[PDB]
Amino acid sequence: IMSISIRLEGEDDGITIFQEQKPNSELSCRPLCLMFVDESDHETLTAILGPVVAERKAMMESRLIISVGGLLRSFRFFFRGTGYDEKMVREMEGLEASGSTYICTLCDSTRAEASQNMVLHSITRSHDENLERYEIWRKNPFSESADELRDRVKGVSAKPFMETQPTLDALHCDIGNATEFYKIFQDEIGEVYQKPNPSREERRRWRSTLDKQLRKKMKLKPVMRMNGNYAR
Amino acid sequence: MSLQPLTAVNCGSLVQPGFSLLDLEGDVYLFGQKGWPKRSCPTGIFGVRIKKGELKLRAISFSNNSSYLPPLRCPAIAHFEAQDGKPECYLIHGGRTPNNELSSSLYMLSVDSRGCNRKVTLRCEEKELVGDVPSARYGHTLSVINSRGKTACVLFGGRSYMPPTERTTQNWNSVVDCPPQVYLIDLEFGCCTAHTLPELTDGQSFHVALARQDCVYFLGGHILSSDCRPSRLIRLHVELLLGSPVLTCTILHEGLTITSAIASPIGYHEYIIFGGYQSETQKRMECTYVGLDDVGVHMESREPPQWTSEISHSRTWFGGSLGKGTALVAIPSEGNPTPPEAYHFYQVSFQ
Amino acid sequence: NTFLSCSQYHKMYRTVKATSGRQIFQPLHTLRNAEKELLPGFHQFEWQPALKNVSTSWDVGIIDGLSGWTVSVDDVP
Ligand SMILES: [Zn+2]
After folding, report:
1. How would you classify residue B25: left for phi > 0, otherwise alpha for psi between -120 and 50, otherwise beta?
2. C-alpha torsion sign, points A51, A56, A60, A62
3. Of A53, A159, A194, B216, which Cα lies nearest the Cα of C54?
4. Of the residues A4, B5, B221, C25, which has the maximum number of CB atoms within 10 A of its CB?
5. Residue A94 contacts B, CB cutoff 8 Å
6. Pick from B214, B215, B213: which is nearest to B235 by CA?
7. Could you give the C-alpha distances from B156 to B143, B202, C22, in angstroms and in order?
């Protein structure tokens, strides 16, 4: 639970009653289902999840009456689907995970063009239009060939099933930035604009001297994979 | 009438318990795959070859004017014979969506161009359903016949989820039999007509049926009403008048208690039933030889190829006919560790 | 909130109740019907309109996650 607000009696947008103060700490993370299966077995996952999605669906329509504050009180609901790593979002929004031509889970930009230009990109990706684009893929009313069919639909082949709110995790941005800076340091130890294509052993050695530098000063030890703390 | 162990060179993670095999003009194409089509092959279908016991799976593609199909799981199949106006057709409908749900779609498939270099192009077209349409379902059976002398298609069987008024989340994955009304469908126009039979007072699933000379013979299968497996063969005789779709049916005294078999067509009509499941735990080990003449069915057994002690201990299995007495089956493979090719593959041959 | 076993708690309970004990902690038995106020499926409610495709029965709690998967072997497992 994140926010609970009030619009009554009207003429106003609303008044926040209680905004949660620390949703990050797991001390507020209430579990609702568990499945002894894998993130990839799309069949098994949807087969178990149908209930959850369907009742989330039926929820957003009606209103809810409980006995609260001594009186019978009413409630509406909206749902913000945020907390997923990218891979999951793609595999559940019907995209091509994870490093293919289409990358922005929001903007229809191709990969390469996101290099020359990087700033102005309007958010377009949305659930209803993704269903529309999947239908266009399935029917192919324009009778296009394979790759123009990829393009006109902006590459939405798998039918999404679970709604998503269009946004990114906060942690894994930090994680990817951390690993990218780590590698860029490993590379700038040597010379790559002086030596365009270095070899593998040079990479191992530059990593080693980078770990020596990060250990001698700052007293920092390596790990296999970088969690949040190593990033920070 | 013998088996041979195979090994998959790679791609041993792209088969799933239910799938389909079609031979249309030579090459065999494999339909259905765990998860949505990867970009390495968006077609979702793989041409299959066997060389030196090793198994090779190659990507395909379609025509520009052909539509792309979702990877159905356990569909219904019809081998629409080479004739007017487009030889040769394969009708598939309507299977199970990988995102677990059903489809009211009909798919007409054919081969279009080749090679130019040992390659094959396919074509897949939807078709509207004028009706009185059949609802979505799975595991059912559909076939094609010529009645004096024009062509028609007969669909029967299959189960589905509870009616949407009764859609209960606690019972979301429950599945009950579709009402026992058969459906007659024409390729053009897509007029679907429902028919009922005062004999077929119960539904059924997974039953392999056969068509010959506008007479259709359904073998017994699994039923969930009385949880039983009536062996009794079911005969029917269908005629397309102008414009009356006249039908008669009858019960045979004895058929066979088989569920979810592999049908290989050996001869003109000389078929073998490879194997499947006789009980909720016992799987039918032996084979079956079936001739079909206009007089009736003609039944016998053959020498069942001795299975490796491995498969004999398997809880389940399945397979498909690579064509002409040849078929492919697979064991859900276990062991330490997960290979992860969870399937051992056996080729099987007649004579 | 400390990851103790039920055996653990019962042992500690007997022990401390021996030492100067006016029974301090509560006996294990009383928790097993003390959470019926905290777990799911205890507070009546309803909706307007009635909820679509979701049974209007409320007092139930934890449910196995298959939702009635027809156990037939030959079918999808
Ligand atoms: Zn973007």
Report:
1. left
2. positive
3. A53
4. B221
5. yes
6. B215
7. 9, 12, 75
For the record, the structure tokens of B186 come out as 């024409």
The closest of B233, B236, B237 to B252, measured between CA atoms, is B233
CB-nearest to B99 from A42, A55, A146 is A42
Are B8 and B26 in contact by the 8 Å Cβ rule? The answer is: no
* Structure's resolution in angstroms: 4.3
Cα B198 from chain centre: 27
Which residues 133-162 on chain A approach chain B with CB closer than 8 angstroms?
137-140, 143-146, 149-150, 157-159, 161
The experimental technique behind this entry is cryo-EM
DSSP sequence for B266-297: -SSS-EEE---BSSSS----S-EEEEE-SS-E
For B205, which DSSP code?
Answer: B
User: Hey, is the C-beta of C37 within 8 angstroms of any chain B C-beta?
Assistant: no
Radius of gyration of chain C (CA): 21
**Which of A102, A144, A147, A157 is best to mutate for the B interface (most B CBs within 10 A)?**
A157
Task: Classify residue B241 as left (phi > 0), alpha (psi -120 to 50) or beta.
Answer: beta
Residue ranges for the known binding site of A are 85
Q: Is-cis flag, bond preceding A98, omega within 30?
A: yes
Q: Are B267 and B215 in contact (CB under 8 A)?
A: no
Burial classification of residue B194, based on how many CB atoms lie within 10 Å of its CB (0-12 exposed, 13-18 middle, 19 or more buried): middle
CB burial readout B143-166, b (16+ within 10 A) else e: bbbebeeebbbbbbbbbbbeeeee
Q: Look-up: residue for tokens 């103790």? A: C4
